[PDB]
Amino acid sequence: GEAPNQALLRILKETEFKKIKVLSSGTVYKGLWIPEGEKVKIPVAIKELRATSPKANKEILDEAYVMASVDNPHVCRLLGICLTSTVQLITQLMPFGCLLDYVREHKDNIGSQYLLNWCVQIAKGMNYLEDRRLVHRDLAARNVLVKTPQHVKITDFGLAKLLGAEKEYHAEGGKVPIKWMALESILHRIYTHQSDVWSYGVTVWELMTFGSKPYDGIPASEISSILEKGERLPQPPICTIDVYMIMVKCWMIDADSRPKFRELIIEFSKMARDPQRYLVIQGDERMHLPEDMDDVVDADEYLIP
Amino acid sequence: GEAPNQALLRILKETEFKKIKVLSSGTVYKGLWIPEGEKVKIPVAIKELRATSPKANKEILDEAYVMASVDNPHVCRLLGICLTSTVQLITQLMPFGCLLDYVREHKDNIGSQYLLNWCVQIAKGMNYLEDRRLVHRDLAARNVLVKTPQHVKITDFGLAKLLGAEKEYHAEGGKVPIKWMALESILHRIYTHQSDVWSYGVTVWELMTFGSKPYDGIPASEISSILEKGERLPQPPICTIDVYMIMVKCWMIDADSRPKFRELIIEFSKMARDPQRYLVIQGDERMHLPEDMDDVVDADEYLIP
């Protein structure tokens, strides 16, 4: 928090990237980035702001600020921004979309190995963010993207806050995903790396249930009371007690009693060595998961200049 | 050790159980568990952690992990945990308390039949733990609870370790009840089902002497030397040579020369068929041992959902 942030913010020319097809409606497109005279085509996601509200541009630049300051295999890579009428945020294309829809659309072919490895990858990304003294505040299955079935990265830094060498972040008001929030956050609007661990717990639960909604019934207004009553999310069927107890620990009320990301890395990694012993899934073994593009290179292989 | 542990960890709502009165000070309470809308009241023991030390919570969860993984009539039944500021472990209430105080407070009414049956029950519980590849490490009269004078269960898994499909467990450091420990454990910190058998022997001796302290004089630091000199606990007065020789066999230095729990079950069971022939107790024959509660049900009769 005293170290100068020397990240580079790259400004890209509009004419250097071609939009191929749309992905959603903010408005994300799927396209290619072709730095002039470099003989490379980089698959890319282009989020172009819709009318420009001085507030909308402020928000997108804050995201670019955060994304530009991170660099880890399990965190989404920012290529740059384009300063056109509408400010476009250009990122690495994550072909398989968000992990939440992915577990839903592929239940029948997702084995224990993939599930446990995702848990390790997300924990590594989160540990890295903690190294950078960055509190995410919106960790969830919807905010993890899939580069390949074997490689996911944390995304959506739209609420991420960089702590000053400051113990916790105190929020204002405004929409927050209460069902993924720690108790001390729903109550006192406090947020820490440990509150992120709580969110990590719910994210794992979403994965172990193949995409179920947490507290699929309860209205957000009640979540707070239920949590005080000492209640938590139910043990997913495929989960041995070893795995569920990790989740449960992430939901302790004493934030410091919850596990540390570096610990989650170790625990899930030991389990990933013998997946069938910690997640019980029917058919687990019998499961398989996945324009001239000669010059195409993934952003992860396209470094600097 | 390759089989997935699919035990269920039940998270209970604070408002589902009423504390009636205290039992000790950790801090154990005596109360009732009233699952919402089930029309049942389950007598229960609630151990609520005092200030929360991230270490204190870690320890109690480990106990819950072990207790949740066992299911046998002679092992203490875990109902669940409550995740409140302080983490509470909820178990089946054992009305008559621990067996150690029980033999002390009731000497004059404890007959050979009760003594031998307890030996069989403890041996059955221990055999079961061995089936689960679980080494208890703290078997003693203080750690056996009394549901009724005719039914006891093994408790306190605060040091119990689950062996991997691993021959023996190697400890670290930290307080250990040396007077109940096998020789190879006091010396090389090794622990096995056989070292548990040694502890089983001392537990029986404590019972046959109606609650006497083993090596009531000797300081813990010496126990190790005395044991090397080939010395052991003295023959209790009420004990025929048949019974004492069983104990003695549990104290062999060659751990594999000691008897197996399944064998202790058979031996004590044969004796339990004709108690007065193996334990000689004055007055043995002339001995007797023992809020709207309409909906009360013991945890042993309250299964699943």
Swiss-Prot record, chains A, B:
Active site: 138 (proton acceptor)
Reported impact of residue 14 to A: Found in a lung cancer sample; more sensitive to gefitinib than wild-type
All residue ranges annotated as the Protein kinase domain in the record: 17-279
Tissues where the protein occurs: Ubiquitously expressed. Isoform 2 is also expressed in ovarian cancers.
Top-level taxon of origin: Eukaryota
Phosphotyrosine: residues carrying this PTM: 169, 302
Effect of residue 10 to A: Abolishes phosphorylation
Annotated effect of mutating residue 69 to I: Found in a lung cancer sample; constitutively activated kinase with higher levels of basal autophosphorylation; more sensitive to gefitinib than wild-type
Post-translational modification (record): Phosphorylated on Tyr residues in response to EGF. Dephosphorylation by PTPRJ prevents endocytosis and stabilizes the receptor at the plasma membrane. Dephosphorylated by PTPN1 and PTPN2.
Function comment: Receptor tyrosine kinase binding ligands of the EGF family and activating several signaling cascades to convert extracellular cues into appropriate cellular responses. Known ligands include EGF, TGFA/TGF-alpha, AREG, epigen/EPGN, BTC/betacellulin, epiregulin/EREG and HBEGF/heparin-binding EGF. Ligand binding triggers receptor homo- and/or heterodimerization and autophosphorylation on key cytoplasmic residues. The phosphorylated receptor recruits adapter proteins like GRB2 which in turn activates complex downstream signaling cascades.
Similarity remark: Belongs to the protein kinase superfamily. Tyr protein kinase family. EGF receptor subfamily.
The name this protein goes by in its record: Epidermal growth factor receptor
